[PDB]
Curated annotation (Swiss-Prot), chain A:
This is Small conductance calcium-activated potassium channel protein 2. It comes from the Eukaryota. The chain holds residues 339 to 500 of 580 of the full protein. The chain crosses the membrane at residues 37-57. Changing E61R: Increases inward rectifier potassium channel activity. Does not affect inward rectifier potassium channel activity. Decreases inward rectifier potassium channel activity. Highly increases apparent calcium affinity. Residues 8-28 dip into the membrane without crossing it. Brain. Changing K59N: Highly decreases inward rectifier potassium channel activity. Residues 75-151 are annotated as: Calmodulin-binding. The gene is Kcnn2. It comes from Rattus norvegicus. It is found in: Membrane; Cytoplasm, Myofibril, Sarcomere, Z line. Small conductance calcium-activated potassium channel that mediates the voltage-independent transmembrane transfer of potassium across the cell membrane through a constitutive interaction with calmodulin which binds the intracellular calcium allowing its opening. The current is characterized by a voltage-independent activation, an intracellular calcium concentration increase-dependent activation and a single-channel conductance of about 3 picosiemens. Belongs to the potassium channel KCNN family. KCa2.2/KCNN2 subfamily.
From Swiss-Prot, chains B, E, F:
This is Calmodulin-1. The modification Phosphothreonine is found at T41, T107. The lineage of its organism: Eukaryota, Metazoa, Chordata, Craniata, Vertebrata. Calmodulin acts as part of a calcium signal transduction pathway by mediating the control of a large number of enzymes, ion channels, aquaporins and other proteins through calcium-binding. Calcium-binding is required for the activation of calmodulin. Among the enzymes to be stimulated by the calmodulin-calcium complex are a number of protein kinases, such as myosin light-chain kinases and calmodulin-dependent protein kinase type II (CaMK2), and phosphatases. There is a cross-link at K18 (Glycyl lysine isopeptide (Lys-Gly) (interchain with G-Cter in SUMO2)). SUPFAM superfamilies: EF-hand. The gene is Calm1. GO terms for biological process: autophagosome membrane docking; calcineurin-mediated signaling; cellular response to interferon-beta; cellular response to type II interferon; detection of calcium ion; establishment of protein localization to membrane; establishment of protein localization to mitochondrial membrane; G2/M transition of mitotic cell cycle. The modification Phosphoserine is found at S78, S98. This protein has four functional calcium-binding sites.
Length: 162, 144, 272, 54, 144, 144
């Protein structure tokens, strides 16, 4: 006699919150029927939520045809970056030599700054080349391995005639 | 074409054309396609390199590259898809379709037409009247 | 043949930004006005009129920009797919989507002074309450739907999908460069940043919405506190459950339901 | 009006034809992964072993 | 090196030297490499064994194995990354780089230099005054 | 017997015959199976194409297809599992079962039968005193 759990919207809210395992708030069943229904809804939700999560996680994957284009898109890059990183090393290895063996007066600050930039350029060049190996490794282990197997089997069967 | 669009397709010709030489051969195309996980056969590679080459030299060049990269980039060729729709029912492998099968498929498979309409389609389709439709000149005369 | 083209992509790119600016201006003004109206000045003062006429004007220019961006898209469709008359591109789906966009972008608090009656039952005590609310709160909240323009601008400004060679290669393989492809690529390359940004952006918006909704039936400063609502949203997101703070109105309950539904998948994705 | 209506229907037919030929390759891609790859390996190994004694 | 480091070095040498012989051959190296999951070919194995072989024998001994193990453990050997940076732009598999290409890459790829500086670099780098600029020199000269 | 069933049967027949020759050979039967992921061998394919054929032609006929399809769609022919139950104990591969083995398996395996029942058997099962009781006739006499 308080219009709390006998309200359709209140019951809807209670079922929704118990389905998601959040828990009750100020609304709890007064009878055993409501408790049994809540138990059934919770048991069903404990598997329904996991199944829905798995489905929505699988729906966000790229297909093989899209992968074959994304690989080309990524390989179009990772080469401009490599060239840009490799040119800086060649620039600094010349700047240091110029400033240390060409000028009449040796300015130490410029030499120190260029020697500091040289290590950064070297580290960037070394870092940019790991992505290429990672991309190659992940682009591998994707071949069918069956069409070539059948082709080789047919060739060996033909060669069996000697 | 913008000069940026020319530096593009050139940064890609550099990818396809390894070891310089300004030429793309079957081996280079096979290597770059296998680097992506694909495993084309010899016939497929030959067909791919034939669909682009126009010199007859057997090698692809940048002018032979820009004439296709500037067309497949945009638009939607209807003449490249009407032919696919035609050859869906051509399982033999030739370039001919029998008139009886054409009439049957037009009058029994999807949004069926009337007998008079398909009869008119056949009568303006069989120019030679020999009972064997080519469906290629039928595309050239109609689409164009 | 690159003459008429490349002269419409730039126009669309500019129109998207000019629409985004006026879209965010109205949101900033509504937040400022709704925060200031609760004590600084009454609804009958001239400040409310001055701060609402600006929102009306911004809405007018936003609609004007949208109804031109769509025309530019139609022109691009005509250029790409060989056609002469523009009625070829007008189908049911396009008209329905245009009408939906106009309806979504044409909501704002109209200048004036109107009130209605609001009743609710207090939680944990079951005591009725009755206050005279304002009509502007009903129309102010739906203005958050203008956030798809950010996604549109980000999609149009991407440096990956805009490359011509990539488009040609993808057309050779017969694939579509729609929004789903971009979302999948972003999830493939940077899966954590997207989740972090989405969660952080949702947190403050949900907390502010709950605070704005539950301020008419709260004379104890429990759920009408920014730090008292952010905590509630955080504990509801993680499925721990409510403590001594539960919504007194249906708006808070709906917001909590949406936050819980989003969290039930966000947590699993982050864990993976 | 008939020409415009039929051109719209032609575009719709084209776009619905291009969509149905992607499932035909998704099915093949997902079905090609069921090969055992061991029986054929053993058969080829036996054949090469027999060919060794030329 | 201390005695303990020699002990770990001998223990590690024992893994490659499986059946004895006091020597590591190509077969032993291939077996130990493939036991870890790697799949090197014959050319790669020969290159690996050549990078360490000293007395033109084809087999690796402990005196020639102790070396390079105290060098690939500390420092960075910048003379090993400068050559890689040069090889980045040398796609022909040779030991020379074109002067015009070198000027272009130094001018229009990353932290662009001035025309006078690159001109001075080209003039100083060309000892023989020829278009085929060597890069083993200019790395064995400046990095003294 | 209805026209609809004939329609689905013809549609299914169209799958196997890739060409329009109206024939199913060892090539199509096996190309389809490898398209479905199966990996049949030559002997298995030969047996499958053999045990549907009627007019000793090697190629499979549409009436031959219908005869097998109209029977392999309903009911469970007991004469197909009785022979399998006989083959369970026929490890050698011939068509004969020794009387002693049959008596032993009937007396010791399953629910077991008394000595009198198995004595009535054999003497009734075997139509001769050879001792090499055939199981192919004890299906066409007892269960026919
Ligand atoms: C991911 C990738 C990279 C290249 N791809 C590709 N290239 C093709 N043609 C090339 C165009 C440049 C060329 F002319 F220099 C050589 C031939 C054709 C082709 N395909 C596959 C899809 O449907 C059949 C044709 N794919 N795909
Ligand atoms: Ca080449
Ligand atoms: Ca050519
Ligand atoms: Ca040895
Ligand atoms: Ca040696
Ligand atoms: Ca056939
Ligand atoms: Ca036959
Ligand atoms: K809980
Ligand atoms: K959980």
């Amino acid at each position: 006699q308080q219009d709390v759990t006998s309200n359709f919207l209140g019951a809807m809210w209670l079922i929704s919150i118990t389905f998601l395992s959040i828990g009750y708030g100020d609304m709890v069943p007064n009878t055993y029927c409501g408790k049994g229904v809540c138990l059934l809804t919770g048991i069903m939700g404990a598997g329904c939520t996991a199944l829905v999560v798995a489905v929505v996680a699988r729906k966000l994957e790229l297909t093989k045809a899209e992968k074959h284009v994304h690989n080309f898109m990524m390989d179009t890059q990772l080469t401009k970056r490599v060239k840009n990183a490799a040119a800086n090393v060649l620039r600094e290895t010349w700047l240091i030599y110029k400033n240390t063996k060409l000028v009449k007066k040796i300015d130490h600050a410029k030499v120190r700054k260029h020697q500091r930039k040289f290590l950064q350029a070297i580290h960037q060049l070394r870092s940019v080349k790991m992505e290429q190996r990672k991309l190659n490794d992940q682009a591998n282990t994707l071949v069918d391995l069956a069409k070539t197997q059948n082709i080789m089997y047919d060739m060996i069967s033909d060669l069996n005639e000697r | 074409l913008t000069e940026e669009q020319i530096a593009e397709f050139k940064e890609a010709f550099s990818l396809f054309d390894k070891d310089g030489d300004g030429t793309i051969t079957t081996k280079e195309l096979g290597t770059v396609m296998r680097s992506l996980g694909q495993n084309p056969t010899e016939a497929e590679l030959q067909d791919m390199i034939n669909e682009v080459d126009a010199d007859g030299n057997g090698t692809i060049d940048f002018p032979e590259f820009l004439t296709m990269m500037a067309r497949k980039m945009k638009d939607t060729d209807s003449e490249e898809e009407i032919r696919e729709a035609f050859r869906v029912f051509d399982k033999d492998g030739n370039g001919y379709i029998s008139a009886a099968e054409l009439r049957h498929v037009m009058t029994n498979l999807g949004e069926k037409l009337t007998d008079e309409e398909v009869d008119e389609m056949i009568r303006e389709a069989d120019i030679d009247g020999d009972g064997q439709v080519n469906y290629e000149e039928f595309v050239q005369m109609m689409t164009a | 043949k690159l003459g008429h083209r490349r002269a419409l992509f730039e126009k669309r790119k500019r129109l998207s930004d000019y629409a985004l600016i006026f879209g965010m201006f109205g949101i900033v003004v509504m937040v400022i006005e709704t925060e200031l109206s609760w004590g600084a000045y009454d609804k009958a003062s001239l400040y409310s009129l001055a701060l609402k006429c600006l929102i009306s004007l911004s809405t007018i220019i936003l609609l004007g920009l949208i109804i031109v961006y769509h025309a530019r898209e139609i022109q691009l469709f005509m250029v790409d797919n060989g056609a002469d008359d523009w009625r070829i591109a007008m189908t049911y789906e396009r008209i329905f989507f245009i009408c939906l966009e106009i309806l979504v972008c044409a909501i704002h608090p109209i200048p004036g002074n109107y009130t209605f009656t609001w009743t609710a039952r207090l939680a944990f005590s079951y005591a009725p309450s009755t206050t005279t609310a304002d009509v502007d709160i009903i129309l102010s909240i739906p203005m958050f739907l203008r956030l798809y323009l950010i996604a549109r601008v980000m999609l149009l400004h991407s440096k990956l999908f805009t490359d011509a060679s990539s488009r040609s290669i993808g057309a050779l393989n017969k694939i579509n460069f729609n929004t789903r492809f971009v979302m999948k690529t972003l999830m493939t390359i940077c899966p954590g940043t997207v989740l972090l940004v989405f969660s952080i952006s949702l947190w403050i918006i949900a907390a502010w919405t709950v605070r704005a909704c539950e301020r008419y039936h709260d004379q104890q400063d429990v759920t009408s506190n920014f730090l008292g609502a952010m905590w509630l949203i955080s504990i509801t997101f993680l499925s721990i459950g409510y403590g001594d703070m539960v919504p007194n109105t249906y708006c808070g309950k709906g917001v909590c339901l949406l936050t819980g539904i989003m969290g039930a998948g966000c947590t699993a994705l982050v864990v993976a």
